[model samples]
Target: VNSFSGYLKLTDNVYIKNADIVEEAKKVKPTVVVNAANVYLKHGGGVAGALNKATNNAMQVESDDYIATNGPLKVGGSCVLSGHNLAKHCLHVVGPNVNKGEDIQLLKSAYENFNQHEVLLAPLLSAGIFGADPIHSLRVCVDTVRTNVYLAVFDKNLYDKLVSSFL
Candidate 1:
């Protein structure tokens, strides 16, 4: 698992295989969890497609049945119920294929709701659903919120600095 012990700036567009991000998530214990699978809109590949399958698996698990070993879901499209035990909701973002500003906007809206005094949990901007670069995502997300938001990766010193700046 890639763990940052101190405050680090998340910038630049980054792509990592499933294992790394999942491992980091387990370590950080983020309040908001975002999972992205490779989704190909045309040929049908990528996180989006994987997420669709995961959603189906979650449903089957709830129903107490085994998921049929089908060759992926299907072309065209299918629906998988979102929001499982992971975080409050799983945002299935379809991107890299297409750029949508809406994802950033959604994050901004969520951040707006947070109370400054509370330790609001949010994923690193670019790491999760947003397709932007890490730094770009961080800047946008941090700027959008009125509250003092801290990424859990901070060390005590860094946390103090962040808190001090906002306070």
Candidate 2:
């Protein structure tokens, strides 16, 4: 199980920490927990999967309902779902899959589109399975700061790497 390792101030109200997203969600009780969503917004794997399981599938249920009403989200598209258990809401944002092509603006927008809340708990968008570099993802989070942000980083190794490259 992941525990809080440390944190650093990124920009005006944005912070990054090496910690478990679900654990931080409970502690921070954020205004919105930003999910590193798939284009379908399905909470089936990675950060989305963990959040879904932790919330007793509330994430998946709401995501399903959202798609049923709306449709699959395009790259950089987003939607919010009423939160359950801990968060006040959850924002599903689809970052670009670099395997297809690098759309940096869309990946940045995925993070930019969700900064209205007082506190946002987000993972490194598109850094995993989607193939965007973790540092690049962290850079987007650092660059786009509109509200207080707690970036919950799951991997200790990645956290160490980010700290060194945080220039």
Candidate 3:
């Protein structure tokens, strides 16, 4: 199966994948499809871009309204859910500036955006054009969750070889 068809268990509570973002959304039906965005709230690419398209651009308008009302968010801060997004909700995290790794804080903040018994569809935040190694990024997710207050990263495995492409 493709990575999106199922998760590759990364560590206990965290999973890895190399799959289309939308199918992951449909299959997982997560409470919140986390979006790594910017101050402008443009869902141009990565998971954000894919989600903006899937939700018929509603994610952008709502996120824009959120930023407009709340003022531009801090790099490690986030926006709460609204009905506009395709998922049960959307957590719009202000992604890192041109650099990476710092987004881990913003990503971690998103786990708090959802509540009890909520499923979260988490992609590798900042692992694409923004420039991050998917391997390190998700490991950071796995590692950080141990110190945090919740556990929603929720997983699987390949027969072998497939995931090692990242390694």
Candidate 4:
């Protein structure tokens, strides 16, 4: 079985783990799995693509339908995506693009959306194409979530950086 390389334990069963996000999500069977989404809700690449692939491309269709009906998501805003082969649902959060002058509040708001679920398996939102600092992204997630949270990352470098934050 897959296992985490490291973790930083927080209060009340919350922790950050160094592992494959998709694999851990399947193992934990969280109430919702989070996707770091773009405003257009396209699951083309990065974490979004990974989840889309795991669900056998169901997320792509679901996301496309969501955009067609509800329109594009605002930065920091979120909506639910249908889940399969992972969890019952997936939470899609549009993270801020730092290079475009978006600020920390937008990223914080992304983490705040986790309130809708009991157990959340989330990534370091905005740390990829959106350009938010990985360490900062991880911090916001750890600080903002009200439910039991599992923050997973696939990169060993990012994992080491986050795990070392407590030292």
Root-mean-square deviation of candidate 2: 3.4
Using all chains and alpha carbons, the TM-scores for the candidates as numbered come to 0.36, 0.89, 0.70, 0.88
Q: Which digits, one per residue and each the tens of the lDDT, describe model 4 over residues 1-167?
A: 22433557755546777777788777766668888888898888889888888888988888888889999999999998776778778899888978678876788888888877877778888987778788888777767887877778788887887777743
Candidate 2 vs candidate 3: which has greater TM-score?
A: 2
- Per-residue lDDT of 95 in model 4: 87
- Model 4 scores a C-alpha lDDT of 0.80
Q: lDDT tens digits, residues 37-134, model 1?
A: 22222212233334335454562343232123322322111223234533344433222211543344444433343433233333443333335554
The whole-model lDDT of each prediction reads 0.36, 0.80, 0.56, 0.80
Let me know the TM-score candidate 4 reaches against the reference structure.
Answer: 0.88
- Candidate 4 stretches with Cα past 4 Å from truth are 1-7
**Candidate 4 C-alpha error for residue 90, in Å:** 0.2
Poorest stretch of ten by lDDT in candidate 1 = 70-79
Worst 10 residues of 2 by lDDT: 1-10
Per-residue error for 65 in candidate 4, Å, reads: 0.9
Taking all chains together, the TM-score of candidate 3 against the true structure is 0.70
**Candidate order, TM-score descending:** 2, 4, 3, 1
lDDT of 3 by residue, 79-143 (tens): 66663535676667664554644545555554343333234566555556656555555555565
